[PDB]
Amino acid sequence: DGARRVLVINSGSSSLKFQLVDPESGVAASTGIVERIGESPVPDHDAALRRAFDMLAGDGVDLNTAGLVAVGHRVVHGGNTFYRPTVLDDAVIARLHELSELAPLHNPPALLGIEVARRLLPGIAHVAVFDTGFFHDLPPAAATYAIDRELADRWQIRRYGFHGTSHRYVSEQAAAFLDRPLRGLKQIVLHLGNGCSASAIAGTRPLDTSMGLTPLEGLVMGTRSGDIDPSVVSYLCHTAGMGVDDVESMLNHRSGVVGLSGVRDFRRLRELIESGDGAAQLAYSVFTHRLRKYIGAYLAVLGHTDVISFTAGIGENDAAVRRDAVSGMEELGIVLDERRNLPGAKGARQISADDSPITVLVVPTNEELAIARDCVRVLGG
Amino acid sequence: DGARRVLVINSGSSSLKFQLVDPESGVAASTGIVERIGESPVPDHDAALRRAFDMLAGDGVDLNTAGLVAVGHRVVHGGNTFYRPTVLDDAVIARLHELSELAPLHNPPALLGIEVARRLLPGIAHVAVFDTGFFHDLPPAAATYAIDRELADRWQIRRYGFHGTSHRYVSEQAAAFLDRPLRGLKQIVLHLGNGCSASAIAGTRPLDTSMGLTPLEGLVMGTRSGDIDPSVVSYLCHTAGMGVDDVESMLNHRSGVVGLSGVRDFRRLRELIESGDGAAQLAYSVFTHRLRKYIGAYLAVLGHTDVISFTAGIGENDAAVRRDAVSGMEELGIVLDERRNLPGAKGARQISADDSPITVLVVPTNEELAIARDCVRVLGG
Numbered sequence: 001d002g003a004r005r006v007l008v009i010n011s012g013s014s015s016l017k018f019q020l021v022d023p024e025s026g027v028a029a030s031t032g033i034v035e036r037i038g039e040s041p042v043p044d045h046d047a048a049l050r051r052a053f054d055m056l057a058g059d060g061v062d063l064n065t066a067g068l069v070a071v072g073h074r075v076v077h078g079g080n081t082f083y084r085p086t087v088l089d090d091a092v093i094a095r096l097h098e099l100s101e102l103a104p105l106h107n108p109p110a111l112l113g114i115e116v117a118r119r120l121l122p123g124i125a126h127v128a129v130f131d132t133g134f135f136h137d138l139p140p141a142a143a144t145y146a147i148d149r150e151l152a153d154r155w156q157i158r159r160y161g162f163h164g165t166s167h168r169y170v171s172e173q174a175a176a177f178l179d180r181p182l183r184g185l186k187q188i189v190l191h192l193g194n195g196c197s198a199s200a201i202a203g204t205r206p207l208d209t210s211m212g213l214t215p216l217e218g219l220v221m222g223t224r225s226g227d228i229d230p231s232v233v234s235y236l237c238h239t240a241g242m243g244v245d246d247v248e249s250m251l252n253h254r255s256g257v258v259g260l261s262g263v264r265d266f267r268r269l270r271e272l273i274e275s276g277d278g279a280a281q282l283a284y285s286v287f288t289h290r291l292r293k294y295i296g297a298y299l300a301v302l303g304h305t306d307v308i309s310f311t312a313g314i315g316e317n318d319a320a321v322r323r324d325a326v327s328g329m330e331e332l333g334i335v336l337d338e339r340r341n342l343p344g345a346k347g348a349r350q351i352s353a354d355d356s357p358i359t360v361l362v363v364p365t366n367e368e369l370a371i372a373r374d375c376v377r378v379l380g381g
Numbered sequence: 382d383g384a385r386r387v388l389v390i391n392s393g394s395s396s397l398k399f400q401l402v403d404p405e406s407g408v409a410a411s412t413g414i415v416e417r418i419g420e421s422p423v424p425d426h427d428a429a430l431r432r433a434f435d436m437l438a439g440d441g442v443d444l445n446t447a448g449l450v451a452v453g454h455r456v457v458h459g460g461n462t463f464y465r466p467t468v469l470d471d472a473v474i475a476r477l478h479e480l481s482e483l484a485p486l487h488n489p490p491a492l493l494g495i496e497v498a499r500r501l502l503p504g505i506a507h508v509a510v511f512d513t514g515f516f517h518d519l520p521p522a523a524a525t526y527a528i529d530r531e532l533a534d535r536w537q538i539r540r541y542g543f544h545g546t547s548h549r550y551v552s553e554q555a556a557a558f559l560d561r562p563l564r565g566l567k568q569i570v571l572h573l574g575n576g577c578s579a580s581a582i583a584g585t586r587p588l589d590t591s592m593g594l595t596p597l598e599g600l601v602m603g604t605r606s607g608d609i610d611p612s613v614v615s616y617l618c619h620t621a622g623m624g625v626d627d628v629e630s631m632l633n634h635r636s637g638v639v640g641l642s643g644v645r646d647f648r649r650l651r652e653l654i655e656s657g658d659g660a661a662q663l664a665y666s667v668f669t670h671r672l673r674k675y676i677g678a679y680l681a682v683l684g685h686t687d688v689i690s691f692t693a694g695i696g697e698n699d700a701a702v703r704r705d706a707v708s709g710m711e712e713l714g715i716v717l718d719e720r721r722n723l724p725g726a727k728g729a730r731q732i733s734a735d736d737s738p739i740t741v742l743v744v745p746t747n748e749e750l751a752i753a754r755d756c757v758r759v760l761g762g
């Protein structure tokens with residue numbers, strides 16, 4: 001057809017995800033992942049993108065015949081410098097390198113992705129979309145940690161927040177599903193995927209969110225601790241023969257659900273629980289307790305809440321998680337309906353009972369589509 | 382009279398507080414503080430207790446003529462080893478020394494207090510009461526952090542919780558004020574003093590509390606950060622030329638309200654706010670936002686909440702804090718009455734409106750009295 005398309009890239013430490021997608025229709029011509037980078041047949045990100053071109057081809061796509069208008073790059077951390085979708089050039093990239101102590105785990109891979117893509121696809125505009133952007137204007141009372149002001153301002157320490165593309169997109173789609181204007185709505189979004197984060201949103205403006213300086217803070221996640229006394233770092237440095245980097249690494253990769261149960265995948269977790277694994281049930285109960293607290297905390301932040309929406313891989317599919325996250329909260333205005341909450345369902349949908357004072361939905365997220373539409377917009381429309 | 386009395390000691394790094402108190406009547410024959418220890422006329426804790434005997438004398442007390450039956454010692458951290466009031470001897474003390482990496486800031490001073498007191502008052506039983514004790518049996522889902530299980534179990538890492546004496550005592554006094562059995566009540570207690578912590582309590586059993594491995598976690602406090610991404614430690618070690626101990630120290634002493642405003646005392650803070658100090662208003666708003674979240678989180682933990690009680694130096698006296706902590710929560714069941722919430726009031730009292738689905742009280746805490754009654758009990762009654 002005469003349809004235009006964006007190639008959306010999510011470049012991680014050892015993986016590269018891509019989707020070629022039509023921003024007007026939302027259809028994805030092709031999608032895939034290149035894994036096990038630099039361990040194996042794909043030693044670097046240059047090979048990974050070349051390998052992705054093969055995958056696109058053997059899947060029937062020809063990039064010249066496809067209406068390619070831009071390349072979107074997911075960058076986790078924009079600091080206080082980049083919050084809007086940003087057209088990439090050499091100067092911008094130099095400024096991005098200044099963010100790498102704020103995001104030493106998550107940002108450097110995205111920048112490798114950008115270098116490779118701009119070289120192998122120099123014919124088209126490249127755009128960065130930042131996971132922190134939606135949250136740049138959090139209220140000061142929520143964005144500011146209670147630490148020494150001088151040091152916080154000097155090293156740009158604040159609650160940045162992440163999954164900003166998902167939280168924003170889901171908040172818009174919840175408004176659309178309810179057929180009510182976004183500007184008049186107060187809502188909570190629960191993005192429960194590999195990373196897990198919650199947000200409280202009034203109209204178009206977020207009021208709070210669970211991730212922090214980095215994507216470690218907040219909810220229990222697949223491999224991340226979420227909330228824990230920062231004293232654990234000093235404690236382990238003093239007792240367990242660990243340096244600060246060993247502790248940070250453990251909190252990011254050996255914690256969360258995998259730290260408590262030995263698995264990171266929630267389907268695997270449910271199998272373990274059903275076979276009587278005590279550690280798996282504990283891990284699930286720790287996850288669920290943390291999640292319930294954040295829902296409560298955000299009902300209090302908002303004061304009035306119209307809708308709570310579950311999203312991402314767990315939120316979209318795990319009926320038990322959703323049941324256990326809001327059970328016993330009838331007196332707080334939340335009532336779930338068992339039929340509406342059934343597993344295997346697709347599409348934006350109501351899972352609350354009809355008379356629930358607060359509406360509860362599942363609203364599938366589509367970060368790639370939202371990033372494709374951001375790219376299209378910033379390039380003149 | 383024929384009245385018996387306990388000398389309750391709270392020994393800190395640079396201070397020693399004491400109160401001589403009648404456990405049956407609750408009257409305090411004498412109370413005071415010895416300050417600026419080892420900086421000055423009182424270089425060590427041996428001098429501080431001798432100096433406290435002077436203070437007791439010049440205030441009209443004679444310890445032999447006073448009915449002294451025990452000495453109570455406040456110990457912050459009991460780990461997993463001590464949770465009930467514990468009669469002190471040399472063996473117990475040896476085991477307490479094993480807790481000093483869990484509590485390097487708070488415990489060592491208490492142990493100096495114990496050594497001095499047992500030497501200068503060898504005629505009577507000495508008892509330790511632990512700030513962690515009330516929380517020893519938190520549910521596993523609340524007590525367990527989502528980190529590597531092996532390492533957590535090896536180094537005894539869990540949510541311990543503190544102000545346990547206050548939370549328990551206030552929960553009992555709230556039941557007494559409402560004339561309803563404790564066992565049937567679900568409640569939240571907000572101990573807002575120098576340290577600040579919240580608890581959620583079902584009957585006689587706590588379900589969660591805001592302090593953690595150490596007294597740093599949770600609410601914003603006078604000089605403590607409360608909740609912050611643990612990544613801040615690694616971040617500052619990598620950027621700001623700080624070691625892990627410098628960061629820990631900053632979070633404990635140069636953070637909270639003093640970190641954001643330059644003052645730690647809430648009366649001073651209110652003066653600054655009233656004169657138009659922007660930093661003081663920000664500090665207050667950060668404190669208040671954190672507090673509102675914990676109230677919300679704990680309403681969700683409990684599912685049904687009968688009563689919320691404010692206590693300690695701020696909770697008992699700062700009407701603005703209490704107003705701002707629960708305003709705009711009518712839809713969550715909380716309605717405050719302006720007349721009932723007036724400053725300067727004394728005694729256990731209702732601050733909610735009559736028709737508030739959830740009752741809100743101020744319930745003055747008396748940790749010394751509760752510790753005196755614990756000492757009396759464990760020594761045969």
Ligand SMILES: [Mn+2]
Pocket residue numbers: 193312367
């Ligand atoms: Mn995703």
Ligand SMILES: [Mn+2]
Pocket residue numbers: 574693748
């Ligand atoms: Mn106190």
